[PDB]
């Protein structure tokens, strides 16, 4: 089939809010979305996984975790996750600081992606086009925060998480894997997938 542009794919298949955040993210780190297009799509994907990971999860009036997929979560519910990814450098560290000195949890050395108020830990989310175990080890070796929980998703549907603790129910993680499958298939139909996969390096 004809070869599409990654730009077209990103703008057509990701929410504009996600795209704008990815653009702002690449700018902050001196990367050009119009040249590093595979990275651009990977940033969008990762960002969306982080949001989907957090979606629908609340801590109820008793302090127990629950899922509310309707539109109106009653006012007394608290979001289960703090989202750190998708924020500019200053705000992200401000949030991390607001979490740490509060919950007493120690400060990480790299910005994680989320904070889990139920499990009382920071989470690093990974999305890989490679083998989950390799990517997991790379992540672990980079941060070695020990307290930061790592959760990896691959585009083949495999997951790997610290201490075989996957945090979320099967359905939540299934939503994420369905979305990644959709991204991969759509890229493939536009003849963008092979390059995207090989780009991760
Ligand atoms: Mn709310
Ligand atoms: Mn991050
Ligand atoms: Mn991450």
Residue numbers in the entry: -4 to 196
Quoted passage from the original study:
Through X-ray crystallographic fragment screening, 4-bromopyrazole was discovered to be a ‘magic bullet’ that is capable of binding at many of the ligand ‘hot spots’ found in HIV-1 reverse transcriptase (RT). The anomalous signal from 4-bromopyrazole or 4-iodopyrazole was sufficient to determine the structures of three proteins (HIV-1 RT, influenza A endonuclease and proteinase K) by single-wavelength anomalous dispersion (SAD) from single crystals. 4-Bromopyrazole and 4-iodopyrazole have subsequently been shown to be useful tools for both ligand-binding hot-spot identification and as a source of anomalous signal to enable SAD phasing.
The potential use of 4-bromopyrazole or 4-iodopyrazole for the identification of binding hot spots was further explored by soaking the compounds at 500 mM into protein crystals of RT–rilpivirine, pandemic 2009 influenza N-terminal PA endonuclease and proteinase K from Tritirachium album Limber. Ligands that stabilize these fleeting conformations not only allow novel pocket identification by X-ray crystallography but may also inform and enable drug discovery. There is also a 0.9 Å Cα backbone movement of Thr151 and Gly152, further expanding the pocket and allowing the binding of a small ligand. To determine whether the anomalous signal from the soaked compounds was sufficient for SAD phasing, data sets with a reflection-measurement multiplicity of greater than 7.0 were collected for crystals of HIV-1 RT, influenza endonuclease and proteinase K soaked with 100–500 mM compound for 10 min.
